[PDB]
Subunit: 430 residues, 3 copies
């Protein structure tokens, strides 16, 4: 069974082979020939074509994915189980993002061993853009300029700079999907159009991901050619330790705390009841393929009713992703600290809004998370070409992210069950 | 019946409350604290967000509205009643626009107490843009530059400046809707797509209009803070007098003159026959909700046949709007004169084309006329932030505009009846 | 039968009348009044409006045409006859384009009697653009800039210049149409949407072509006003001789050579068997209206089976166009040589890719070839206003282009028949 194993596990095997070949190619080139500044640019050309192909696809991706995601989410929510589950999902995703931001600006991996009033208003000025086609490639920014005729008086001058406006497209696609999801039959052709557009965009993303290992091979070789000291391995170790301690103090402290405030039972017996689901999510790395095991572990081991589980588990396997959100926040601030920049209070809120509302805008596909890392890094303006320092270590943390996601919706069943008990009686008598 | 009256009349009541609160807030701020140049900009920030939200929505609005409007108008016109009614509607709308422009440049409310050959060719150069995506945000303009090697010889240099091209989008959406309205079954998916897009855009415009009174509150407070002399109240009085004398000499002189040229009967007995329809259009301010009363007043009081009324009245309640067109022309030139600019012969024809062809491109909705005032002011390049000086007095003239619209299509039934009498005999014998 | 002949042949008659009237108008103006530099620009204004209308329509044209063309081509190919016929079509179109480029840079009609490494990488950088809305109006270009701190070291700086990116739109529409053609039922609304969009775009192109003769009248008058010497008639004669010798050595030498390598029979008896089809394609100038005659001449005169002819002939009448591809390559390099420019090795490959993949992207319509000449001239950045020097002589070469196309797919039936004989036996026994 040699060819079947290659056909089953092509993604992880080809990523690992690309990283190994890129490291040994950069080592064998660095110890055989020097390279000038110009021929260090022609050597990292397939990585440049990959970074162009990844930024090509995010503009149909966020539009189609946000519209169909919030339309299907408006369709799935029916009564009072739906609103409670959705409020729970977005509160825990926001708590995970805030925990990740706090941990990465406190530990600071990557650093070497103005007026905030204007930035927090350019945020709201970028949520409502003045043009919907210019929001696809250019952003707004205001500066304070002094005026000339005893006191010092200024005024505010705004201008449009280059780079895509992700907040404006996210907010307009949210409002547009909520509008066409509520029109009923008169707006079904729009929902079908954007559903087919989302499926076509995910197929093109799969084609780009089939190209990807050649690009990351030449990118990793071009990274380790110019590296002279063994310093960035320490920064990658600290980044992996930051993501792992974020998932550790999110699955152990915060989510049992929420279960103890709401349900007021013992959360650790509940976590011990779901052992086989977490073991399966460690073994196979999908939250949707772990689903029958967590149905079995929440239904017959824990005393959770089936009528609530049937809604909370299959919907929470696709829009409740806490570990991926913590990962994307920590990785975006790590790439920002690696390039010797400083994030303000506008770029941190743009990271925290883009990473929260990307559970909707990833279409529930495992082979798209890299593209989400290009969205967040293009939501604030960072160079995306350091993304190749995260794909090298992604296969070490993917399983732990899956475990944190599955533990999130597994706790969510019990929390939503204890939160609303009147509706089960109302549906049990009639 | 206190809450039902609030649920019925929320628009007018909330606009009036916003104007009153903005005036008393600006008075109580102006007599308690001075404001610098910078903190006069942070105080008028919700108005800036409202003026961004209003300019966000006009680009899907004019595309969807013009395409579905001219497609449904091509569908409604069947024989020779249709062409006569449509030619009548657009001739009277053009006459009302020309009368409004003449009255506002003769009275001149707002003023304080080049080469036209190139501009009239940049008009035609902007009706056919060189790119269809750049027409969504940028315009063309030619200047005359002297050439250097006995006579003085020049040449022409063109460049693209910023701001949306409304004429190019209007002309291309006219041609595109006429094309897909005539393709039959092969172009029905496009008609359904743009119909659903138009309905979604009108729902988002209703959301923006639900936000609107907070924005106009802070805009009116920011207007009357910086005002030192009681001069702009005189200009608002002259603007209201200009709109009222435009509607007065359009409903009394011009439309009975057209009825006397075409029909050669007495128009004033015809106007006295439609008294209850005009009284209802004064009472309730909708031209589509006044429709059964004008059916009754034209059918049984006047001797107008039913077979022509069934087509002229419900189609002319949505695309024949003379009072709104006169209003938008007068208000656009009033905002142009209030900012101490001068309109050429290119901007006046752009105002007269954008205001005429906005009866099609407003989708027949009462809660969208403000957005049309943002289109005309963005068709020529005027600052839209003086729109808040027109919403303060709009509820005084809305009922008179409704009366002029209803009188227009009420005269139109009799004019189209006397114009074509062969078709009624041809459909009466067979 | 005077009015029926005018209704049948309006295109050729109106083009010839426009050329004759433009020449006699330029002669009668040049010998009656001098014209300054400024009034030579107002005289060529309808041609400027025509050249704006032609560039307005190519952006929906290439998108809709490439998507529906490659989707319907993916649908038509079923077994092994389809792949063989498609590979044959694109190999012969590429051979015709290469022959046309070689002949026009060897003969050089139009001439008067950097680093290629960077250009051949900006080609691949423009095939994958960084933004999909900016690909509709702007292109990428890299230059080499020296760096300043013993050897001379440079770096590479890229920037976005104006003009549409045709390679990026062509490649993305190819991949998008291949994706939605393979999704089956889930992507049928996209195929129907782009089919209706393609039909509407071809109707608008027919409207523009109905305007066209007034524009080419004023363009030809403006051309021959400024001409002082009788030199450009010699260049037009050499251009017609270049296109005619390209079609001559493509129909006589190259295609019988391919038939002799593959089939190893006598190709000249095969060409003599199809005499009536070529005579009809000389008489009427359509490759789709010549189709029953070439069915009859290949079926009953030549010994070609019907089961292969039923697929090769009606599909090869619309996507196998060798003469039009040779024509567009020769005409693009002729317009480039007429304006005293020099084409690199990037612009020649952009011409050779845009002209090859425009058989798909012309929607199989005879009244669209002029628009394809605006695409190729806008794929490399040439001034399109010299297109009026090619429409004057197009009706002399259109019939010979039709003959070369028909000879191409007529040889293609026999080549694909001798190439695969196992499938006919497999479908004859079962
Ligand atoms: C309270 C804080 C959280 C607010 C949002 C959670 C959903 C609220 C709600 O009523 O949802 C039910 C409604 C359905 O309404 P309903 O009519 O079923 O009640 O669901 C939605 O509106 C779908 C979710 C919309 C997107 C929410 C996340 C935004 C992310 C970017 C910031
Ligand atoms: C939708 C809206 C989403 C808003 C997200 C806001 C995230 C803010 C994170 C700030 C982190 C930071 O700067 O830490 C610096 C410092 C650490 O930097 P240090 O290096 O000085 O230590 O953080 C702290 O000291 C902790 C601050 C309090 C933690 C919570 C902050 C957010 C509170 C509001 C939450 C939403 C309600
Ligand atoms: C801070 C902002 C505070 C806003 C407060 C608004 C309070 C008034 C609500 C009135 C509701 C009402 O009367 O509904 C009856 C009408 C129905 O009656 P009808 O007859 O008027 O229609 O309901 C609606 O039209 C639905 C509106 C729902 C949303 C209302 C506005 C919410 C706030 C919007 C802010 C701006 C959003 C920008 C969106 C576009 C961006 C692309
Ligand atoms: C004469 C001056 C007015 C010309 C336009 C009026 C309609 C003419 C016509 O034949 O309409 C019937 C045709 C139907 O054609 P038919 O085939 O029924 O005849 O109706 C239309 O074409 C719909 C109206 C098109 C838009 C007209 C207004 C343009 C506004 C911007 C300037
Ligand atoms: C579709 C095409 C639409 C074309 C609309 C053109 C409107 C022109 C209005 C000009 C008003 C003006 O400048 O008035 C200045 C002056 C008043 O300015 P004053 O201040 O010197 O007095 O107007 C006049 O003196 C009256 C001019 C004649 C009135 C009619 C003008 C238009 C004639 C053609 C109509 C279309 C056929
Ligand atoms: C000033 C402009 C004067 C233009 C005069 C045109 C006169 C020739 C009309 C010939 C009609 C004919 O033969 O029809 C038969 C053909 C049918 O026969 P067929 O076999 O050719 O197809 O009819 C059509 O194709 C329909 C064309 C209708 C419109 C004709 C052109 C009108 C003027 C267009 C100006 C430019 C518009 C730009 C539009 C695009 C903008 C986005
Ligand atoms: C070998 C050189 C030519 C390669 C392209 C020819 C088609 C190859 C093929 O497998 O086609 C069958 C496939 C169908 O696949 P299949 O599944 O039937 O096998 O057909 C296509 O993919 C349609 C043609 C795609 C476009 C090809 C031309 C590109 C022009 C721009 C450069
Ligand atoms: C999809 C990819 C399409 C690639 C098309 C490439 C076309 C190249 C044409 C070059 C013509 C030229 O510069 O001629 C100069 C000179 C003539 O210029 P001269 O003026 O010195 O004579 O051409 C030659 O000398 C002949 C060159 C060989 C002919 C074939 C060239 C292309 C070979 C690769 C084909 C694809 C495999
Ligand atoms: C020079 C470039 C060389 C690229 C070589 C790629 C070799 C690996 C192919 C692996 C195929 C595979 O495993 O398929 C199984 C999977 C199915 O198994 P699955 O379970 O992974 O899904 O097949 C696919 O996903 C279909 C992919 C077909 C195309 C594969 C890539 C071709 C090359 C793409 C280059 C970049 C194109 C850019 C497109 C976007 C532009 C807008
Ligand atoms: C580590 C600590 C700081 C975490 C604290 C988390 C809480 C702030 C969150 C987590 C889950 C939240 C709950 C999730 C779901 C709901 C249901 C929600 O229901 C509705 O909005 C009304 C539904 C209806 O009646 O229609 C009300 C808030 C509530 C109880 C939330 C209250 C706030 C909670 C407890
Ligand atoms: C104050 C004064 C200057 C106003 C003058 C207005 C006139 C110039 C307009 C108003 C209504 C117009 C009429 C409205 C409708 C028609 C039908 C229209 O019919 C057709 O186009 C043909 C229909 C067919 O036979 O198919 C011919 C012009 C006509 C009589 C118009 C002629 C010009 C009129 C009288
Ligand atoms: C003047 C000279 C230089 C012209 C040379 C032309 C050749 C390079 C081309 C012309 C037609 C081509 C053939 C057209 C079609 C096919 C079928 C094609 O079939 C497949 O790809 C496999 C189909 C399958 O098995 O599914 C293989 C190549 C082949 C023989 C091509 C081989 C190359 C050929 C002979
Ligand atoms: O549980 C998951 N399924 O798909 C996502 C998430 C973690 N692993 C995937 C990823 O983000 O790569
Ligand atoms: O009669 C009318 N119904 O709707 C329109 C028009 C006048 N009042 C509305 C407006 O334009 O605000
Ligand atoms: O055979 C042909 N039918 O349509 C095309 C091609 C040659 N003549 C047309 C053209 O390109 O103009």
């Amino acid at each position: 069974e040699w060819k079947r194993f290659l056909k089953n596990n092509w993604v992880l095997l080809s990523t690992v082979a690309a990283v190994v070949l890129g490291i040994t190619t950069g080592v064998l080139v660095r110890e055989h020939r020097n390279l000038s500044t110009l021929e260090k640019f022609y050597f990292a050309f397939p990585g440049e074509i990959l970074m162009r192909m990844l930024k090509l696809i995010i503009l149909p991706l966020i539009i189609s994915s946000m519209i169909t995601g919030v339309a299907a989410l408006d369709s799935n929510v029916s009564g009072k189980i739906g609103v409670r589950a959705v409020v729970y999902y977005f509160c825990t995703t926001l708590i995970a993002v805030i925990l990740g931001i706090v941990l990465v600006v406190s530990i600071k991996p990557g650093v070497t061993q103005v007026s905030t009033v204007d930035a927090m208003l350019d945020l709201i000025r970028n949520m409502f853009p003045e043009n919907l086609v210019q929001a696809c490639f250019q952003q707004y920014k205001t500066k304070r300029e002094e005026v000339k005729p005893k006191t010092k008086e200024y005024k505010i001058v705004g201008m449009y700079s280059d780079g895509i406006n992700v907040l404006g497209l996210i907010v307009f696609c949210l409002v547009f999907g909520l509008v066409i999801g509520k029109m009923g039959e008169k707006g079904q052709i729009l929902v079908d159009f954007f559903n087919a557009l989302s499926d076509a965009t995910m197929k093109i993303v799969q084609i780009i991901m089939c190209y990807m290992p050649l690009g990351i091979l030449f990118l990793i070789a071009g990274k380790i050619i110019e590296v002279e000291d063994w310093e960035i391995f320490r920064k990658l170790g600290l980044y992996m330790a930051t993501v792992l301690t974020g998932l550790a103090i999110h699955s152990i402290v915060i989510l049992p705390l929420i279960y103890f405030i709401v349900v007021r039972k013992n959360p650790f017996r509940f976590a011990m009841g779901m052992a086989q689901a977490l073991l399966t999510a460690l073994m196979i790395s999908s939250s949707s393929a772990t689903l029958p095991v967590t149905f079995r572990c929440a239904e017959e081991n824990n005393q959770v009713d089936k009528r609530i589980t049937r809604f909370v588990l299959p919907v929470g396997a696709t829009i409740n992703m806490d570990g991926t959100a913590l990962y994307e926040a920590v990785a975006a601030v790590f790439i920002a600290q690696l390039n010797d920049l400083d994030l303000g209070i506008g770029q941190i809120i743009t990271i925290s809004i883009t990473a929260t509302s990307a559970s909707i805008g990833a279409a529930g596909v495992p082979q798209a998370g890299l593209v989400t890392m290009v969205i967040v890094l293009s939501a604030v303006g960072l160079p995306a070409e350091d993304v190749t320092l995260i794909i090298a270590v992604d296969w070490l943390l993917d399983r732990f992210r899956t475990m944190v996601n599955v533990l999130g919706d597994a706790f969510g069943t019990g929390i939503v069950e204890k939160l609303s008990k009147k509706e089960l009686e109302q549906m049990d008598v009639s």
